Amino acid sequence: QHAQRQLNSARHYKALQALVGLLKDACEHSRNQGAKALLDPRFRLEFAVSVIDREGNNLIETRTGSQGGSGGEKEIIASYVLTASLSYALCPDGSSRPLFGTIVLDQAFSRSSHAVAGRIIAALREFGLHAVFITPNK
């Protein structure tokens, strides 16, 4: 932006040189952070998740990842977010009902307790899909 305004003052050739050189350099090195931040629109945002109580609307906890958690918490959070994203990513992305509904879980419930598994199954059925399970005799 700075370069642009200087050009507006010049109306003399070095401003054009610098602007074109900056743009050309930005064209190269697409694998660096600056080029991603300048051209790709999706790199100009920051995302976060929040837990909100049912009644009312209150922030209870804000997270940027899955750090510092226990064993079961990481598994449940990851499964929940992944299945929600997958459900959106299918046909209901552009609305309508999914045309290809199925999801495969491997080593299901390798670290959680009974109640966590119950919540997982309840949420998975509520999302409205079909599941196939792969477990040892645990």
Partner: protein, 97 residues
């Protein structure tokens, strides 16, 4: 907590504090701890000593009161463990404040 001399076990529901006890034991011996190792399979570590001594529970939310921390201000913590072989007995301990 006691340990029978013929092999014991620890059980409990999820998110109870078992690994907290095991890490409180582990801190007393190794030169540089790797807290909460088994959770991620053996690749990274997550917690740190001051986090334990101040008892933070979850990342919480914004604000300034910082309700997600139990102890604020002056505090004292003590850890101790006991080994027995035959009559003779030894104790290893640490005091922080």
């Amino acid at each position: 907590a006691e340990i029978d001399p013929s092999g014991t076990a620890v059980i409990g529901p999820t998110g109870s504090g078992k690994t907290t006890l095991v890490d409180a034991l582990m801190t007393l011996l190794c030169a540089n701890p790797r807290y909460n190792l088994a959770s991620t399979g053996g690749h990274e570590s997550d917690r740190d000593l001051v986090s334990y001594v101040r008892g933070v529970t979850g990342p919480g939310d914004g604000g300034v009161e910082q309700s997600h921390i139990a102890r604020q201000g002056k505090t004292v913590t003590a850890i101790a463990a006991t080994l027995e072989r035959d009559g003779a007995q030894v104790r290893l301990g640490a005091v922080l404040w």
